[PDB]
């Protein structure tokens, strides 16, 4: 079996970025959100959009913000360790599956690697036990089309799925995603897309009327 990616303090966040969080009102986020080292003014969420705590490095940001530089410093550092751990896994089970377009696949547990932009234009299933692990290594961008749903089968849990992307993620409008996203750049969601997972971006997270839930 594949070892879990350890997220350390970043596990406590539904959204964690380095250059902020933009939003087209209204989104529904369940879990804590933060950004560091950017000012909390870069978190464009309202208090009614977050069930959890909004963390700021400073006195700026949404009215309900909690200022805690040292926790955000640890979280972002733990996110970079996680990113490097996920990107550093060797001996993949698959390389360039579906020639970088994986619509209609059922993905069984293991380490997958793509030396390309990964596209998900139609529904996929992730199928495995409640203890199985998936690590998806994407050297490029990751695109999922409007209305595409990731279905979990067999007991597979969102908390045991990790998507490591060297490029930006784009989740199309009304798409449903499952798993943790460790992005070296942005995570960009569209109109009423949902995610059961964490959005961990070393640039920005951008939302448009999204539902975001930390995995349970």
Author numbering: 61 to 276
What does the paper say about this structure?
The FfIBP from Flavobacterium frigoris PS1 exhibits high TH activity and relatively strong recrystallization inhibition activity. The FfIBP structure is composed of parallel β-strands in a helical pattern, which is mainly stabilized by inner hydrophobic interactions and intramolecular hydrogen bonds with long α415. Additionally, the FfIBP has a capping head region that consists of two small turns and β-strands, which contain a disulfide bond. This disulfide bond increases the overall rigidity of the protein and reduces residual movement at the ice-binding site, thereby augmenting TH activity and protein stability.
